Swiss-Prot record, chain A:
Any one GO molecular function term: RNA binding
Family: Belongs to the eukaryotic ribosomal protein eS6 family.
Gene name linked to the record: RPS6
Maturation and modification: Ribosomal protein S6 is the major substrate of protein kinases in eukaryote ribosomes. The phosphorylation is stimulated by growth factors, tumor promoting agents, and mitogens. It is dephosphorylated at growth arrest.
Predominant place of localization: cytoplasm
Cystine residue pairs: none
Any one Gene Ontology cellular component term annotated for this protein: cytosolic small ribosomal subunit
One biological process term in Gene Ontology: glucose homeostasis
Protein name (record): Small ribosomal subunit protein eS6
Subcellular localization, as worded in the UniProt entry: Cytoplasm; Nucleus, Nucleolus
Binding partners and assembly: Component of the small ribosomal subunit. Part of the small subunit (SSU) processome, composed of more than 70 proteins and the RNA chaperone small nucleolar RNA (snoRNA) U3.
Organism: Homo sapiens
Modified residues ((3R)-3-hydroxyarginine): R77
From Swiss-Prot, chain B:
Gene from which the chain derives: RPS11
Chain's role: Component of the small ribosomal subunit. The ribosome is a large ribonucleoprotein complex responsible for the synthesis of proteins in the cell. Part of the small subunit (SSU) processome, first precursor of the small eukaryotic ribosomal subunit. During the assembly of the SSU processome in the nucleolus, many ribosome biogenesis factors, an RNA chaperone and ribosomal proteins associate with the nascent pre-rRNA and work in concert to generate RNA folding, modifications, rearrangements and cleavage as well as targeted degradation of pre-ribosomal RNA by the RNA exosome.
Chain positions with N-acetylalanine modification: A1
NCBIfam families: PRK08572.1 (NF006345), uS17_arch (TIGR03630)
The name this protein goes by in its record: Small ribosomal subunit protein uS17
A biological-process GO annotation: translation
Residues bearing the modification Omega-N-methylarginine: R68
Keywords per UniProt: Acetylation, Citrullination, Cytoplasm, Lipoprotein, Methylation, Nucleus, Palmitate, Phosphoprotein, Ribonucleoprotein, Ribosomal protein, RNA-binding, rRNA-binding
Highest taxon of source: Eukaryota
Phenotype upon changing C59S: Abolishes S-acylation
Localization (cell): Cytoplasm; Nucleus, Nucleolus
Main localization category: cytoplasm
PROSITE patterns on file: RIBOSOMAL_S17
UniProtKB/Swiss-Prot annotation, chain C:
Family: Belongs to the eukaryotic ribosomal protein eS8 family.
InterPro entries assigned: Ribosomal_eS8 (IPR001047), Ribosomal_eS8_CS (IPR018283), Ribosomal_protein_eS8_euk (IPR042563), Ribosomal_Se8/biogenesis_NSA2 (IPR022309)
Protein name: Small ribosomal subunit protein eS8
CDD domains, per the entry: Ribosomal_S8e_like (cd11380)
Name of the coding gene: RPS8
Chain residue ranges for the region called Disordered: 1-26
Organism: Homo sapiens
Residue numbers carrying Phosphoserine: S159
Curated annotation (Swiss-Prot), chain D:
Annotated Pfam families: 40S_S4_C, KOW, Ribosomal_S4e, RS4NT
Subunit structure comment from the entry: Component of the small ribosomal subunit. Part of the small subunit (SSU) processome, composed of more than 70 proteins and the RNA chaperone small nucleolar RNA (snoRNA) U3. Identified in a IGF2BP1-dependent mRNP granule complex containing untranslated mRNAs.
Subcellular location: Cytoplasm; Nucleus, Nucleolus
Species name: Homo sapiens (Human)
Lineage: Eukaryota, Metazoa, Chordata, Craniata, Vertebrata
S4 RNA-binding domain residues: 41-103
Protein's name according to its UniProt entry: Small ribosomal subunit protein eS4, X isoform
Chief subcellular location: cytoplasm
Function: Component of the small ribosomal subunit. The ribosome is a large ribonucleoprotein complex responsible for the synthesis of proteins in the cell. Part of the small subunit (SSU) processome, first precursor of the small eukaryotic ribosomal subunit. During the assembly of the SSU processome in the nucleolus, many ribosome biogenesis factors, an RNA chaperone and ribosomal proteins associate with the nascent pre-rRNA and work in concert to generate RNA folding, modifications, rearrangements and cleavage as well as targeted degradation of pre-ribosomal RNA by the RNA exosome.
Keyword Nucleotide-binding recorded: no
Length: 118, 153, 204, 259
RNA sequence: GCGGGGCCCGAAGCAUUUACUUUGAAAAAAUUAGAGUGUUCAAAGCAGGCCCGAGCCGCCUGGAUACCGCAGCUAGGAAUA
RNA sequence: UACCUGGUUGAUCCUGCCAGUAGCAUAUGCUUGUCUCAAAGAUUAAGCCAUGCAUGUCUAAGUACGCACGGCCGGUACAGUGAAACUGCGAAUGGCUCAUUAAAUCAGUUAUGGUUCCUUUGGUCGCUCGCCACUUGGAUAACUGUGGUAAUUCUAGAGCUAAUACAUGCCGACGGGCGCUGACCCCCUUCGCGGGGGGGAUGCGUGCAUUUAUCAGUGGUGACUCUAGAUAACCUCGGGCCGAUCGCACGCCCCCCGUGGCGGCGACGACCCAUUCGAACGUCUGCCCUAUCAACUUUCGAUGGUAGUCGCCGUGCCUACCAUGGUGACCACGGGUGACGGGGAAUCAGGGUUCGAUUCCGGAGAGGGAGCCUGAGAAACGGCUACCACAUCCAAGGAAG
């Protein structure tokens, strides 16, 4: 039962998770279902706890602070292409979109392009 | 013999009472209009409902009650219960099982408009119907025709 | 969940009744709003039909009406001095639809001297020089002094009303429905009616 | 229960729609529209029971999804739209142009018209009101509204509007001696001139109706639909001619025509 | 209702109100009574009917009609009560 | 077919009742070939249920970056079809049964002028005078990828990814008109005189809707505190409106110039007015058995008056203050009902008598009471949580009803 932002109870309590809190995907509109949850205080009653590193320390962890997987699901809105590239104005933004080479073994290579919005 | 008997200033809403008293409007001459309307199927507005001095939110001539629908008739039997008289309308139900009639009645409470002086025991009263006024009071007194009188010693 | 329909009353004869169905949604719950005086807090509740009513949890100001001279501007709300219905509400400063509320007069003061050219809210003299005398002087021309000095015959008010203009505040009456619509509007006491409600304030 | 209905059982549907007792359990259940669910006749059974251009309910959709049904000039693609009174259909594929008025026996009559008189309709007014900014409005027998009307048109006048344009076309003021058709009650489908509009304060007004053949009957006012000055209809006029025949008057013209 | 002409005929007064009767509206279908129809007859059903000369854009027609008490709405009748 | 016969007696004539008869509607015996329409777990038990299911849904036309399909027909916006997911609409209709329920539901009849109403339509959609506008912003899901769990339509962290989701938000129309104000009009009665105006520089405000109060009497109804217009302001930040949308067949003048100006049919969004669906609620009349149920209600709202409180709207609908009233042998109140109400069914000289749980409409309830979210529509149970009672999985931790 996952840990939840702002419970502050080292233990396991039951709250009524509405559409949008955390830890419960509701199944119809307005459906409030009360499910048990675990408080945000850490304990040794945890089989696993997630962790997010926010600063480099010493060295190259093998496969963790190197091997950047290149971001393939890139910009599609015309202010995410118009946030990265520093294209000024009247630049024909459509030509300069992020693209992808395609490499199924069974088929020939392709390059694929998104749609666009705004 | 005063009108302001309740704790709040009872007034008709529509007529505007606070209008421009300057020294051109001298305080030795005091007057206000008195609001009244006319309903509809031919009833009079009696004398003391136009120039009268009373006040009501539920009189059919000078209150917000717009009376419409049925019009029924009855006999006054009980004249207690302020601004509300109890009329005992009385009919003759027919049963076809014996081909003979049956006396039945169910009395009914109506709103006494306060423009009337003598509404005594035993009076034929015509009464129309309107919106719900209270839990028992729906209907409303229009006009009292003569009964139990024209000559009392 | 508070009901509002008929079946928990006793009927006309005075005999009990047994309800045949659960109470429906259209007898919507009825919490008391308690409009009181502070800053502005306004809450909403969606109702049947999708409409929104602004129930008024706390207020500052209103949009009162002088009426007789057709002067409607804002003013702020000071104090509650009388309420005819329930004697609880006036010692705890709650605004309802017919509570005699006390408000300042200085937004009506700066309209009165702006239009009628009389001293109002000023009583002794020798202090009214900087911008307080020029609200009527202005170096008016011939055609201006003609139209304002004929308005002197339509510029008297009964002495029990502007006596508190000199002293500062007016008691008005709410006519809007706070806790239902979301304002504290209303007319200003005047006439024989001002003679009434000051007398009942006097006798409490 | 908790909300409004969206089915309709068979026998609740009116008896002049003439539905089979045994084909199934349900009715058309027409859509919400300008003509209410009891008076009106929907487009569906008009094609599969009346005109018989179809077989099932599936057949009626796959002519009506291909957009050749023009109720009052407007291309409609739903299957159970409420058609109503003073209606003109338009196939515009092989020239149909029907008009659905009540027959002499109280039913909707398939009635053919030329493609040049199919260019309008007539609308009994039922409420005018001065709208905002100083303009007047009105409303029709169905759910149509008209801005800026001719102010001789008073209450329960019948106006005319022409399709594909929509403006006012003709008006005819309600008065005695003038021809009308009753569109509801025990006398609907019989057509006659007006003796007088007899009035009631408060209650329903009931009028005295004289036919063209001297019969004197009467209905209340909320079914009278005027289509005639003096006696001339402004519309094509069916067989039966708005004259209802008695049970002896029918049987001799029915048993001399199968000879 | 073709400032005072005549062939004018109303808005209305309903001048004790009702009880009773009479006519007219409004009274969901089904069902019961019933009108048409060789489902092969019938309970049923709402359908069916008529000629190829390939013109056969296929013609004509049915799917009626009452019964819906009591209580209200209507215009009458005024003996009896 | 307005119909009777056998029995009290040694007999006769009676009052009486028993039995016979004929239905039609349950069960059951015995028996049974064909053929056409065929009721059916309601009667007691509104008792409990293992299981498998009875509600979802893409249009050319809200979002494709799944390589999952396309010949990537080529040096790049997308040949589209598409699995999933986001959004929009439903899931409040059907369907099951009759436990409640005796002026209740319900049947007419008449209102809502005392009110809300998704969709469909028909109207409104430059009416407002105010330095991103050739389009402004932040995530989130499907997904690459690490998982915990004994377990469920359990789901956490990290990567990024759109909008008709969520916000914001102006250009142009828009030049101004309009009443309010006010240093300049002198041409007029300036002649000690006082005038009567038009012109204004100035500074405010200009709509639909909300709200308060006011003037006045186009269109109004047997009838208005109706609608419409004018005067004076507000305009709720969990804040009302004046389209930052998606396609389809392409065209007009191209003249500041090979760049910007302009057009069609749509498809959705859209406050409000009216309709349509309806719902709510009020009026009048109408119900079974019972007096071994004759007085009932009123601290505790019982009936009415004020004045508010929330409420979609009427009101004891609450509260406070008052009033002392209301209903009754014309059967109230109390109780019983093996009572859901009706359209009907059987029966039939006429009067009636009995049933109608049941396929049509109206109401009630989804184990028993109660409370709510989202929605136009719910006191929803093929939605949620609490309690009661019954009941499942389990590795004993918790899930599921």
């Amino acid at each position: 039962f996952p840990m939840k932002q702002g419970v502050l109870t080292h233990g396991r309590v039951r709250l009524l998770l509405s559409k949008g809190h955390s830890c419960y995907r509701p199944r119809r509109t307005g459906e409030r279902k009360r499910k048990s949850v675990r408080g945000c205080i850490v304990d040794a009653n945890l089989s696993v706890l997630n962790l997010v590193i926010v600063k480099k320390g010493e060295k190259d962890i093998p496969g963790l602070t190197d091997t950047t997987v290149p971001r393939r699901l890139g910009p599609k809105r015309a202010s995410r292409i118009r946030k990265l590239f520093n294209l000024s104005k009247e630049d024909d933004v459509r030509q300069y979109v992020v693209r992808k080479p395609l490499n199924k073994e069974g088929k020939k290579p392709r390059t694929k392009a998104p749609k666009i919005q705004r | 013999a005063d009108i302001q008997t309740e704790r709040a200033y009872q007034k008709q809403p529509t007529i505007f009472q606070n209008k421009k008293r300057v020294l051109l409007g001298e305080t030795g001459k005091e007057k206000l209009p008195r609001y009244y309307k006319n309903i509809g199927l031919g009833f009079k507005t009696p004398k003391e409902a136009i120039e009268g001095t009373y006040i009501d939110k539920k009189c059919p001539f000078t209150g917000n009650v717009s009376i419409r629908g049925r019009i029924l008739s009855g006999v006054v039997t009980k004249m207690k219960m302020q601004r509300t008289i109890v009329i005992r309308r009385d009919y003759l139900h027919y049963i076809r099982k014996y081909n003979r009639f049956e006396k039945r009645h169910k009395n009914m409470s109506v709103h006494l408009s306060p423009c009337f002086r003598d509404v005594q025991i035993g009076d034929i009263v015509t009464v129309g119907e309107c919106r719900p006024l209270s839990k028992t009071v729906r209907f409303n007194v229009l006009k009292v025709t003569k009964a139990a009188g024209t000559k009392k010693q | 969940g508070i009901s509002r329909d008929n079946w928990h009353k006793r009927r006309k004869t005075g005999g009990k009744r047994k309800p045949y169905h659960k109470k429906r949604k259209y007898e919507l719950g009825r919490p008391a709003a308690n409009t009181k005086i502070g800053p502005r807090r306004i809450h909403t509740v969606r109702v049947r039909g999708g409409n929104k009513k602004y129930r008024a949890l706390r207020l500052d100001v209103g949009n009162f009406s002088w009426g007789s001279e057709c002067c409607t501007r804002k003013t702020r709300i000071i104090d509650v001095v009388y309420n005819a219905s329930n004697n609880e509400l006036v010692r705890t400063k709650t605004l309802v639809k017919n509570c005699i509320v006390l408000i300042d007069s200085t937004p009506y003061r700066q309209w009165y001297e702006s239009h009628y050219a009389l001293p109002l809210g000023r009583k002794k003299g020798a202090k009214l020089t900087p911008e307080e005398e020029e609200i009527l002087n202005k170096k008016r021309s011939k055609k201006i002094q003609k139209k304002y000095d004929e308005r002197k015959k339509n510029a008297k008010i009964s002495s029990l009303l502007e006596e508190q203009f000199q002293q500062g505040k007016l008691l008005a009456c709410i006519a809007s429905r706070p806790g239902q619509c979301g304002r504290a509007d209303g007319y200003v006491l005047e006439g024989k009616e001002l003679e009434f409600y000051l007398r009942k304030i006097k006798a409490r | 229960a908790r909300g409004p209905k969206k089915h309709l059982k068979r026998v609740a549907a009116p008896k002049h729609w003439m539905l089979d007792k045994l084909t199934g359990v349900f009715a058309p259940r027409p859509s919400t529209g300008p003509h209410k669910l009891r008076e009106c006749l929907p487009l569906i059974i008009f094609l599969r029971n009346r005109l018989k251009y179809a077989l099932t309910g599936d057949e009626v959709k796959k002519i009506c999804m291909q957009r050749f049904i023009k109720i009052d000039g407007k291309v409609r693609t739903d299957i159970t739209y409420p058609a109503g009174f003073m209606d003109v259909i338009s196939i515009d594929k092989t020239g149909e142009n029907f008009r659905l008025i009540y027959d002499t026996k109280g039913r909707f009559a398939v009635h053919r018209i030329t493609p040049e008189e199919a260019k309008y309709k007539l609308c009994k007014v039922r409420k005018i009101f001065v709208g905002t900014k100083g303009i007047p409005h009105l409303v029709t027998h169905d759910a149509r509204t008209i801005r800026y009307p001719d102010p001789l048109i008073k209450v329960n006048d019948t106006i005319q509007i022409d399709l594909e344009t929509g403006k006012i076309t003709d008006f005819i003021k309600f008065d005695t001696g003038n021809l009308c058709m009753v569109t509801g009650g025990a006398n609907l489908g019989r057509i006659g001139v007006i003796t007088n509009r007899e009035r009631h304060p408060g209650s329903f007004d009931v009028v005295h109706v004289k036919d063209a053949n001297g019969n004197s009957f009467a209905t209340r006012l909320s079914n009278i639909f005027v289509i005639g000055k003096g006696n001339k209809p402004w519309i094509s006029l069916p067989r039966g001619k708005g004259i209802r025949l008695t049970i002896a008057e029918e049987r001799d013209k029915r048993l001399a025509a199968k000879q």
